[PDB]
Amino acid sequence: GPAFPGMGSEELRLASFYDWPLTAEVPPELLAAAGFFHTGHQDKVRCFFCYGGLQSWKRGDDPWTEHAKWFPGCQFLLRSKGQEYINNIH
Numbered sequence: 001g002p003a004f005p006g007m008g009s010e011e012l013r014l015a016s017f018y019d020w021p022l023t024a025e026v027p028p029e030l031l032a033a034a035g036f037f038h039t040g041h042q043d044k045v046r047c048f049f050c051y052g053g054l055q056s057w058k059r060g061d062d063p064w065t066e067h068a069k070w071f072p073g074c075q076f077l078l079r080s081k082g083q084e085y086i087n088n089i090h
């Protein structure tokens with residue numbers, strides 16, 4: 001099961017980005033879709049399922065790509081994107 005079931009909703013995750021500092025650079029919509037919510041501190045985000053945290057986002061970073069790069073064992077990532085996608089990033 002998810003590490004943090006309470007952030008399993010994409011809409012709740014999107015709502016968490018109300019004070020996101022990088023709107024143009026790394027869209028909240030893409031982050032939320034990729035399982036991430038904003039912790040509220042700097043640009044630190046975390047996946048509701050694997051609880052993997054990421055920060056220091058660069059402009060044009062792709063949330064799904066970063067998810068697979070750093071947390072390839074995440075089952076939310078697997079269910080959403082499939083194994084071929086994860087394999088191709090690694």
Ligand SMILES: CN[C@@H](C)C(=O)N[C@H](C(=O)N1CC[C@H]2CC[C@H](NC(=O)c3cccc4ccccc34)[C@H]21)C(C)(C)C
Pocket residue numbers: 039044045046053054055056057058061066070
């Ligand atoms: C350039 N793209 C970004 C998304 C990226 O690759 N981020 C990386 C990144 O955040 N991580 C790589 C794998 C993990 C391990 C440590 C990094 N996580 C963190 O530093 C972190 C993220 C979110 C909340 C946190 C709260 C308290 C401490 C740390 C922390 C994360 C980077 C190491 C900072 C470069």
Ligand SMILES: [Zn+2]
Pocket residue numbers: 035047048049050051052067071074075076077
């Ligand atoms: Zn995850």
